[PDB]
Design an enzyme around this catalytic site. Structure first.
Site, PDB file in Angstrom:
ATOM      1  N   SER A  84       0.760  -1.242   0.000  1.00  0.00           N
ATOM      2  CA  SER A  84       0.000   0.000   0.000  1.00  0.00           C
ATOM      3  C   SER A  84       0.779   1.273   0.000  1.00  0.00           C
ATOM      4  CB  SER A  84      -1.068   0.109   1.086  1.00  0.00           C
ATOM      5  OG  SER A  84      -0.477   0.079   2.314  1.00  0.00           O
ATOM      6  N   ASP A 117      -1.826   4.499  12.697  1.00  0.00           N
ATOM      7  CA  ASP A 117      -1.646   3.050  12.759  1.00  0.00           C
ATOM      8  C   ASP A 117      -0.188   2.620  12.647  1.00  0.00           C
ATOM      9  OD1 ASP A 117      -0.959   3.207  10.013  1.00  0.00           O
ATOM     10  OD2 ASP A 117      -2.837   2.318   9.244  1.00  0.00           O
ATOM     11  N   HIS A 132       0.685   3.711   7.712  1.00  0.00           N
ATOM     12  CA  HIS A 132       0.217   4.553   6.565  1.00  0.00           C
ATOM     13  C   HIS A 132       0.291   6.007   7.006  1.00  0.00           C
ATOM     14  CE1 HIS A 132      -2.126   0.712   6.082  1.00  0.00           C
ATOM     15  NE2 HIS A 132      -1.613   0.855   4.868  1.00  0.00           N
TER      16      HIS A 132
HETATM   17 CL   LIG Z   1      -0.483  -2.702   2.477  1.00  0.00          CL
END
Ligand SMILES: [Cl-]
Ligand SMILES: [Cl-]
Ligand SMILES: [Cl-]
Ligand SMILES: [Cl-]
Ligand SMILES: [Cl-]
Ligand SMILES: [Cl-]
Ligand SMILES: [Cl-]
Ligand SMILES: [Cl-]
Ligand SMILES: [Cl-]
Ligand SMILES: [Cl-]
Ligand SMILES: [Cl-]
Ligand SMILES: [Cl-]
Ligand SMILES: [Cl-]
Ligand SMILES: [Cl-]
Ligand SMILES: [Cl-]
Ligand SMILES: [Cl-]
Lengths: 219, 219, 219, 219, 219, 219, 219, 219
Positions: free
Chosen positions: B15, B191, B194
């Site tokens: 991500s 978190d 991110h």
């Molecule tokens: Cl990810």
């Protein structure tokens, strides 16, 4: 069971209490209570004590600090004429200090927090049957992580207030701490604040235990 | 600058790399690259070295471990014929051990990580002009937090595969550690994974520094 | 670095400054700043100078001319008590003359623009530490394209004002012009005004250079 | 009118042709034709020559180059059995050279353009009653702007394929050039390609003039 | 061309004029005019007379009768200071009589219609250069269909008013009637009121012819 | 009642039948039947003959002609094993001749209509307990309107196939004609085809009358 | 037929009457009446008595009790100047007692219900031609199910009021009861209150029978 | 606790089980389990027995009967290799008999129910560590309501298959019956099937009690 037949129990707090509850009224069997610990408490009370007829209202608002609670206390608490009030606040008061460390007006430091929380309890106490003070929490097992260490300071203030005012007391941090002997925080909450169903069940159970709920009644 | 005129630079990872890039192609100036460090890298290269004419492809996919990279390597890396391949993988390989501790098939333990990453690097190296290995990271300043400690181990594997294969190396943990002397993790990433635009800038800057970018060209 | 510890930097302008920022407040680490140069500036400042604790507010509004700025100046600038104010305005003042040539009330001609811009600077200057005047721009390399030629007239007025008022000065057109020796406008902006990430990085870099940002600190 | 009673007229091209037409069929009176020049042509034919009974199909596809037309020619042109085919292609063939200068596979350079367009015209001509070749265009009045200059070259190819194949020819650049003596490009098209209703009217009018439409029939 | 350089032409009416125009202002080159005859008129005027610089405003509102026009006339017409006003109204005044025959307050009968329309013209006339009265219409070729026969009564009143007040006059019904020698109504409008692009082109052409537009200028 | 206990009644046709029924199955009490005459029939049967236990399936598909029915007949009619089949088809077969007069492949002229409908009825009749042929209709009281006149011819074909095959017959045109002595078409259907709830009630009532429904049972 | 030509019939009630009707006006042929019994009544009246020209208004509001009706009676009933008023209320007055047994303020007990309903009738009666009182209902065939038994008490009060005030009377429960000799409730309504089309047809039929509708007129 | 460390517990059933679980996998801590009793079970296990490390999969699918379970058993149960399988099926098998009494193919009568459930249990039992058979239920306190009476019969089949196969058994009807001594069904479930959070808590509690959960561990 501390809570009697026909009485009104009102929860207030931040997002952990709110969990998408209906605004403004926050009251009803079919989704108005939101999707977290408050709803679970009500579910368990109806499943095990259906005949008590306890009315439950959810006045949680996401993002609130204790400053915010005080600003809506007359409309959202006093005017509801509850018999029991449960308060869980502090997470944001602390979190802002760490996530937006230079936006200082969003911070509520400990001595303001303590006096404001005490003011809410003392205003309320002559008007209700009882008060339940639930500590804030941080889902982090290292006591020396800065946010955890701060949170614990706030929880100790809540405990002191509950003792001084003869309120009921729920140590949510202690409840989490038991589970954190096994689980890393991220298994409960990526952000260490907003948990899974499991986390909400930790909270609901901690609350029910303090009001003398029985899972299977002796009665 | 290690990267030279007319070369195709392909980024792959999870991500942190993906950041909403266009699928399947991941290429182009107008939003296809996503909204994080890969786009920021391409923007800075374009602002400061417009004449280099670098083509950049984003093959990040949210959720991936190195086991997922291996499964798509042929079609997403080798078939794109890149000149330069940048890899950043490991966050999920680790994070699943901690957030889903009982779903062991989702975990990629150090033996699988090293063997697989090693194999990809070795297979790729003769096919391209160069490889850049970026460590995974965890936005957490306590080296003894269990997940930070694991992540540091995975990052030692990456460093040692880079050294062995004479690949370029970006120590992204060390870049966060510097900022973490000042900021609590939540100011960059609730978190711990991110991050804000600032976190993606820390990543883009670490990458660019390793490839010999100059903010103002010496000329 | 001109900007000191604890100070408040406020950006104002049109869509190029706005880039989807939160209204009305425009302040925060997690998306309120929008997705363009302002956010990038903040990202780079936090990545390289995390300890400065600079608060940044985005007061950009899409479509604005300098007439519009003056209409909201008291609420959006004065009332925020900033230490530093950055202004980028003129693009629309000019663009309307060319895209809606017969809707004359939308046009702000040069002599009104100059006096209005000067009025904002002179009102503001005694209330802040400093002002940064950024020229408008048009992403077009032919100096004799009518809109480019007009834009340059406005940029020269901004430069004159900055010199006269001892404001800081960013020539955005000159920044673009360097890149336009290599790229056709359409590679940066189909419309010659609203650019890619690269264009925003051109702007952010130009701004940072004028405030004495260092990419890697001597410090 | 070159076009006669009961004939099927099929338009093909890129976004300028597509304008949101129904896919795959592209045919019908009630929105299937899209919202630009093709619809305007059909509307004017119907308003002024209702008795002609012309069937009109829109096979425009946004983004296409002549390489894309070739790939779908069998199924979208030949298999429709048209009587008349109108082609307008080239904008993207050129524009990609300028907006994505480094993604060379997306470019269709003059050699490929001419050969391919030529081949399509030659293959089609014996199968239909007639072909109308419309130049691509760029809404830009400076003949020495680099993209305008390229587009003019592509348009010379179209003119010379039309002459060679005795196809009808519409010089759309010349139709815009006339209006550009008055209006700056941005008044018709911010991006110099996708215009207002006025631009689509310039296109529809140029087409109709070439096919011998009369605004008020001489009769 | 009756309309001169720099003048403001304002259209008012019902849904046929409205066609999704921007509210409230109804003015602009890029979609504010809606998607029907008004936009087409503006398109053709800019395509053929770009140098006239005519400002055009669309004040159509879906559902309106002439009673409704009178209720908004001061804000939507007088206050705009137009040079030319075009009116098309009557369709709903009549249609309600036939689609909601027992909701009588929605009906505007002919003698009220005539006096109200005359009142608008006479109020307006001393304030403008000119007025264009466009008849209502019904896309039905049988003169003895009850709604058609009624509509024609209203159109005759419009003609009488235009003659008496020296306004310009557009017989929209006559324009449709020519096309209805070939097409069944449903080919233009399923509902016999809201037409295809073709129907809108019928209207735009009829309007342009009455103001002395030339498709190809002698000039 | 012609229809008896435990029988499966399957309705097929175009939009008038479909009315948003569930696809593919079209069966059930709770919305699967759609919102028009088929649902109204089933509701009235249930309200007045609940004990009959009739199962009802809606296989209507918007847009269909009889050519479309033939293409799906095996899977949508024969494979459902109905006891009773009700057909209403022809509106689109006709309407396309009038609303798309030049798209001749979409037209189903009287020769194809009769042959196809005839063939379906003949193939079906030995497989089921009974067939009900409902005429198409056009909500238009003038028998010499061209589309009404065509529709009346198609309806004569249906009547004569019903007579020949000893099928039940519902003259839906005649049911509308009665109301059209009072109401102009637009009060039932702006487009003369898709009516209000009142129109669907006219259809449901005509069907029920033909099958010997009693509003209050004689018993 | 009790209802005469040109008269206004107004329905009021709860969700069963509302069924998504347009607010506030609730009047029109094309969907404003909602999708249940009220619309069906209007449909059948227009299908069988088109020449009566009866205007029908739907003032149902989901969730209402009789207390709620009284609160809006002046605006929603008196001010409409109806000739006939139909009332169906009680379902919620009762249902709350059983679904939210501890939220007592939502309950309307029988003696308050009776006096409030009587007050509405007596206020209204001198102002209209007639009143139709429809009982509430519960789709449950066991007379001794607690909610059914309660509902029946309320229906008996409605009957008594209708007798005393010379209003028309519809026993909806008796209508359901006939159907419930065959169907289990769930075939009509999962919740025993909000029914299928069939249930709405039960209601519409019961209402029409009491006003002397004929399915096929003797007339 | 019957369920032990490291075991995989797989729940299967209809909507009551599904509650919006992630498809196809149904596994994970963060919402994949859905929002009813399965999630509540997993939450309570985690809150009170975090160290057990139980993996839990939700294979519920809304609408299913036991015939549907059989059709997916291989891929959704056997192929998941569970240790413990919990089955709750029968609601729909019954409910279709009552809500769609005439669609007999949708009914699963007692012969098919018993044979099929029996076969699944017998096939599964040798492949897993244990099976838990949960009765279907109907939230209705009258044992002679026809659907309650049927459901009780289906639940006797489940009890006797559990006894025969030495499976664990949860009598969910008996758990509701206890609360139904106090509450009318509508306070838990308007439709007597899909309940509030309180109903899902009744289910979760019944399950947990059968597997020997302790609310506070004896230790
Ligand atoms: Cl990810
Ligand atoms: Cl609720
Ligand atoms: Cl919060
Ligand atoms: Cl792109
Ligand atoms: Cl933010
Ligand atoms: Cl802007
Ligand atoms: Cl169409
Ligand atoms: Cl295109
Ligand atoms: Cl516009
Ligand atoms: Cl209208
Ligand atoms: Cl259904
Ligand atoms: Cl249809
Ligand atoms: Cl309506
Ligand atoms: Cl209701
Ligand atoms: Cl999950
Ligand atoms: Cl289900």
């Amino acid at each position: 069971m501390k809570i009697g037949s026909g009485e009104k129990l009102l929860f207030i707090g931040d997002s952990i209490t709110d969990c998408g509850r209906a605004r403004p009224e926050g009251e009803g069997s079919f989704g108005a209570l939101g999707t977290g610990y408050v709803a679970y408490v009500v579910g368990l009370l109806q499943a095990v004590y259906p005949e008590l007829g306890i009315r439950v209202v959810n006045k949680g608002i996401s993002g609130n600090t204790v400053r915010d609670l005080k600003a809506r206390w007359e409309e959202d608490v006093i005017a509801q004429k509850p018999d029991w009030v449960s308060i869980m606040i502090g997470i944001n008061d602390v979190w802002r200090q760490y996530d937006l460390p230079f936006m200082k007006e969003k911070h509520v430091y400990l001595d303001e927090y303590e006096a404001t929380l005490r003011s809410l309890v003392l205003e309320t106490k002559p008007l209700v049957k009882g008060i339940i003070l639930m500590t804030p929490f941080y889902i982090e097992g290292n006591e020396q992580d800065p946010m955890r260490r701060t949170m614990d300071q706030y929880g100790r203030v809540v405990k002191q207030i509950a003792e001084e005012t003869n309120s009921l007391f729920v140590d949510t941090q202690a409840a989490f701490n038991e589970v954190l002997k096994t689980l890393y925080p991220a298994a409960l909450a990526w952000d260490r604040v907003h948990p899974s169903v499991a986390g909400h069940m930790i909270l609901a159970r901690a609350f029910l235990r303090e009001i003398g709920f029985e899972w299977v009644r002796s009665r």
